[PDB]
Amino acid sequence: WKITVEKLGPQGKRGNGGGWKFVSLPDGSSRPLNEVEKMYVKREAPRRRRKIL
Amino acid sequence: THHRHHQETHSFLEPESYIGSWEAPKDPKDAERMLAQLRRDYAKKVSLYRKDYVHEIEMLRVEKQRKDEARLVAERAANEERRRLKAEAAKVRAEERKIFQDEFRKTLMKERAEKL
Amino acid sequence: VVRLRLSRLGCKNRPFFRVMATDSRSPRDGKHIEVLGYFNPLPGQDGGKRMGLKFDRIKYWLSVGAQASDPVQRLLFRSGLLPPPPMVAMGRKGGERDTRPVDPMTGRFV
RNA sequence: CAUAGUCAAAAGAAGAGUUUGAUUCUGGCUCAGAAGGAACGCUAGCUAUAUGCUUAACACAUGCAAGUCGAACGUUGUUCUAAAAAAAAAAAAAAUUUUUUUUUUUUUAAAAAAAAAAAAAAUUUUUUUUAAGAGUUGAGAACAAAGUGGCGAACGGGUGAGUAAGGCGUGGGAAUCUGCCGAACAGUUCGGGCUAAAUCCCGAAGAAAGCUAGAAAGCGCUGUUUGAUGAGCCUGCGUAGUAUUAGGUAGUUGGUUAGGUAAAGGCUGACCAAGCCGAUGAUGCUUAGCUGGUCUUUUCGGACGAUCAGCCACACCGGGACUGAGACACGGCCCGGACUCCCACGGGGGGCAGCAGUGGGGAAUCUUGGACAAUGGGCGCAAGCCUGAUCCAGCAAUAUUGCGUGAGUGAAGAAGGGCAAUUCCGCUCGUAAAGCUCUUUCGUCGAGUGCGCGAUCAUGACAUGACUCGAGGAAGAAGCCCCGGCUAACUCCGUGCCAGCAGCCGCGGUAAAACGGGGGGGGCAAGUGUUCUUCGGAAUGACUAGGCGUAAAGGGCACGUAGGCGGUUCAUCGGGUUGAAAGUGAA
Ligand SMILES: [K+]
Ligand SMILES: [K+]
Ligand SMILES: [K+]
Ligand SMILES: [K+]
Ligand SMILES: [K+]
Ligand SMILES: [K+]
Ligand SMILES: [Mg+2]
Ligand SMILES: [Mg+2]
Ligand SMILES: [Mg+2]
Ligand SMILES: [Mg+2]
Ligand SMILES: [Mg+2]
Ligand SMILES: [Mg+2]
Ligand SMILES: [Mg+2]
Ligand SMILES: [Mg+2]
Ligand SMILES: [Mg+2]
Ligand SMILES: [Mg+2]
Ligand SMILES: [Mg+2]
Ligand SMILES: [Mg+2]
Ligand SMILES: [Mg+2]
Ligand SMILES: [Mg+2]
Ligand SMILES: [Mg+2]
Ligand SMILES: [Mg+2]
Ligand SMILES: [Mg+2]
Ligand SMILES: [Mg+2]
Ligand SMILES: [Mg+2]
Ligand SMILES: [Mg+2]
Ligand SMILES: [Mg+2]
Ligand SMILES: [Mg+2]
Ligand SMILES: [Mg+2]
Ligand SMILES: [Mg+2]
Ligand SMILES: [Mg+2]
Ligand SMILES: [Mg+2]
Ligand SMILES: [Mg+2]
Ligand SMILES: [Mg+2]
Ligand SMILES: [Mg+2]
Ligand SMILES: [Mg+2]
Ligand SMILES: [Mg+2]
Ligand SMILES: [Mg+2]
Ligand SMILES: [Mg+2]
Ligand SMILES: [Mg+2]
Ligand SMILES: [Mg+2]
Ligand SMILES: [Mg+2]
C-alpha cells in the first residue's frame, strides 16, 4: 500500500489550513504529489466561512 | 512554516536496496546467525539516528536562547530610555508645582489672620 | 519505559489508531504523555492509506530514547524516521493472484 | 506562483383551565415540551452502533482469569550410534557401497592399517555377553521429571463501604528516591559454605558475577557523572447541610536536645513555657467518593456523578511486618474473630466488590461463548509461551434525525357493516377491497471467486459474514391512545346518582357528544399509552428578574461590636486593575 504522510505540527504547516504532504511509496522511495493527490488535498481542507446554500 | 521550505528542504529518498535482499542459506543454524546479525545491524543504525537527532535539537535550542538574549537587551535599552524621559518630565512638573503651592500658602495665612 | 505506541479509536469493525507517547505501565486507552499523530488502517478512496506525524516531537522522544513498538517501527520507517526493521529484508510471499479487473463504481467484473 | 490566498465558531425568549352574580389584583394547584442505567400494559419486520443488578460492600457450586527463562546453575533418567570435503547416467534383491584429497593415531624409516566364549584363516574376521569407577567413548535427541536461581505477580481488571479535608480541582516549592530505556567514563581480583553446582549466601581488598569461540568482543553485573519517566513530602487558592450543636484541645501550641526516616517535620523519648483553634462558625450531628462531564434551560441556574477517561479509598471483619527500586500487597505471609467444608477426627482448607454462572432481595437488568488474527502488557538474544486486558460473536424494542410493510390502475360504486325529514349512486366504510400491469429494497433459498479489507516478511476468531450472480411472487411484515372544554376529532344502542370514568374543571337521577358496545373519525407510527424521577412553563426564592399602608411580610424604640457603605485638590508608589509575551488549561 502507499501512504500519504502529513507533517503535522506548527513547524510542518503548508499554510493556513493543514500540513505538508508527501507519499513514500512501498519500495522505500518518496515523491511529491500528483494532480489527483493535489485535488484531494485541496478538497479535504477546512473552509473559513459559514455554509452557503 | 511555509510551502517552499518543505518543498526545498525535504530529502525525497531513493528506492531502498535493503528490501527483499535476503538469500536462502543451506543450513538452518547458519540462517539464524545472519538473522541475528541483521537484528544487530538494526540497533546500530538506531543509535546513530539517536545521535543525529540530539545534535539538531541542541542546535535549535542555542539559537532560541541567543534570540531571547537579543530581545532582552533591546527591551532593556528601550525601557531605560523611557525611564529617562519620564524622570525629567516628572522633575519639571515638580518644579512648576511649587510656585502655585507657595502662592496658595500665603493667602491661607492671610485669611486666617483676618478671622483671628 | 517511554514508548511510542498505537491506541484504538473508531467503533466496532471500524478501526482507527492514534500514535501516542505513553508510559509503559499505562492502560491502552488511558494516561499518555503526549499525542503524536494518527493512522488510518483502512484503505481510502485514492487506493492508499493516510498518516500524519509530529516530526519534531517524535525526534525529541527518539533522542531521549523512547522504544517504538513493532507496528510503530514499520510506520516510522515508511515515514523515514527510523532504519528498516530486520524482517522486512525478506521479500514477499509470491503466488498467483485474482487479477480479473473489476469496474470501480459497480463492483462487477468489467 | 500555488500543496499559496479566503478569518467561520452557534442555535435557543409562546401560553392555557380553575376562587366571583360579574371585575381587577395577590396567590397556589393542574396541563401542553424535552429527557432516563427505568418498570408495566397492548402490539411487533430488518440492519448497524451504543447500553444493560440503581436493591443485599448479601452468601457462593463449577471452570478459567500470572506466568516465563536450558543463552544463570547442578542432579538423575530415558533412548539409539562406535575424522572432514567432492563425484557415481552404459554392458558382457538393493541401502548404502566404489573412487580422490586433506587430517589423527597404531603397526613394522619408508610403507601399511578392553575382557570372555565358539568357528575359520595366516594377527584378523563372523556371532554373543559384560563394557565404560572407566590408561579421556566419540556425536546427536528431548531433559519438565523434580528443583535452585533471575525477572514479573506493586501493571492490567473490580467496587464506591469509608472519607466534609490527610481527599479532589488548579497553581507552585525544597528537604529525597528512582528497576527496565538513552548517552559518557572504569572495572568485573581471590578464598569459603549450601549432600551437587551457580549470576544463591558469607568474607578480603573498593563494589561486583559470571556465560559464550554452541551467543568471543556478543550478553550481564558493579562504581561514578548525567538525560527521560515515575514516586515520597510540603503548600497558596477554591470545594455540603445544620446555631432547637458555643466552646474545643492536653502531644494539645511552640522551644531545646536525642532517636528515627531516602527525605523537612511532635514523627516521638526527656526537659521548659502556656499556648493553639473559634461568632469570617471550632467542635458535635446528618449526608456524601472528587473531577472532565450527562439531562434541562436565551445565557444564569437546578438535578445527577450511571457508561468512558484522570485522582483517591477498599479487597470476609480487625491488627502487623518480611521480600523488594517500588506494597504494609484483590487470586503473597503471620495473628485474632465470625461463617463454611473435609477429616483417618490429630487437624487442616476458603474468601468471585476479576469474566461467565447460582441462590436471596426486588417493579427490574445478559452467555457457565470463540480467539490471541489486530492493539497493549510480562518473560525470552531469538524461536516462542501466557493474557475472561482486549477484539469478536449470544440475549434484551433499553436508546439512536435509519429503512421496509409495495408503484400504477380499477365502478360490476359488488357483497357485507352503520346511519337516515328516512333529501342528491339516500349518506358513509369506498378506489377502499377483489381483479389487471410493473419492480423486488429488508428478509427467504441456491451457488462462485477470494494478497476485497481489517496485515503484513508471514500470521484472519469474526466468516454459515460481506461482495457478485441466479430462483420466485405483492409474495413474509400495523398497531397504540383519543373524539364535553383545556385539545385535532360525532352519531346509534344498553344502563339509569346504579354500574362506572377522571390530569384539572367535573359527568351518570329514562332521549349521556363525558359510563360500556357498533360504526365513523383524529394524532403518532414499530411503536404507542400508564407509573416513577429531573428540568422548563414557574418572574412559583426574582444576580439576570419580586416584594412588606389596606392581600404572606417593617423588629415596640434606640445605642453600639464585627461587617457593609461613604466629600475635595496636589504629589509618590505599583497590591488590585489593565496591555503585550511565555508556560499551563490531558484525551
Ligand atoms: K459547623
Ligand atoms: K486532572
Ligand atoms: K482487611
Ligand atoms: K496478542
Ligand atoms: K418499551
Ligand atoms: K403483504
Ligand atoms: Mg373570596
Ligand atoms: Mg461479599
Ligand atoms: Mg520462580
Ligand atoms: Mg493492582
Ligand atoms: Mg466494567
Ligand atoms: Mg465512580
Ligand atoms: Mg457512601
Ligand atoms: Mg426561563
Ligand atoms: Mg456535587
Ligand atoms: Mg455498576
Ligand atoms: Mg518483583
Ligand atoms: Mg528496605
Ligand atoms: Mg498480588
Ligand atoms: Mg477473587
Ligand atoms: Mg461477576
Ligand atoms: Mg423473587
Ligand atoms: Mg504483542
Ligand atoms: Mg524484548
Ligand atoms: Mg425510528
Ligand atoms: Mg437482498
Ligand atoms: Mg446467501
Ligand atoms: Mg488480507
Ligand atoms: Mg451476523
Ligand atoms: Mg375541538
Ligand atoms: Mg341514553
Ligand atoms: Mg375524556
Ligand atoms: Mg364514551
Ligand atoms: Mg426559575
Ligand atoms: Mg410577589
Ligand atoms: Mg421598604
Ligand atoms: Mg414601626
Ligand atoms: Mg407587627
Ligand atoms: Mg491623581
Ligand atoms: Mg498597580
Ligand atoms: Mg496565552
Ligand atoms: Mg480537552
Structure write-up:
This is part of a larger assembly, with chains A (53 residues), B (116 residues) and C (110 residues). Chain A is built from one helix and three strands; from the N terminus they run βββα. Chain A is of the alpha+beta class and 53 residues long. The longest helix of chain A is centred in the last third of the chain and has 9 residues. Chain A is globular. Chain A starts with a strand and ends in a 10-residue tail after the last helix. With 116 residues, chain B is mainly α. Helices cover 81% and strands 0% of the residues of chain B. Chain B has two helices and no strands. In chain C, strands 4-3-2-1-5 form a five-stranded mixed beta sheet. With 110 residues, chain C is an alpha+beta fold. Chain C is globular and about 55 Å long. In chain C, 22% of the residues are buried. Helices cover 16% and strands 32% of the residues of chain C. Chains in contact: A-B, A-C, B-C. Chains B and C meet through helix 2 of B and helix 1 of C. Chain C binds one RNA strand of 587 nucleotides through strand 1, strand 2 and helix 1.
What are the SSEs and their pairings?
This is part of a larger assembly, with chains A (53 residues), B (116 residues) and C (110 residues).
Chain A: E1 3-8, E2 13-15, E3 18-22, H1 35-43
Chain B: H1 3-8, H2 28-115
Chain C: E1 2-11, E2 14-23, E3 34-40, E4 49-54, H1 55-63, E5 67-68, H2 70-78
Parallel strand pairs in C: 1-5
Antiparallel strand pairs in C: 1-2, 2-3, 3-4
Bound molecules: potassium ion (6 copies) and magnesium ion (MG) (36 copies).
Chain C binds one RNA strand of 587 nucleotides through β1, β2 and α1.
Compose a concise summary of this entry:
The PDB classes it as ribosome. This is part of a larger assembly, with chains A (53 residues), B (116 residues) and C (110 residues). Chain A has 53 residues and is α+β, with helices and mostly antiparallel strands.
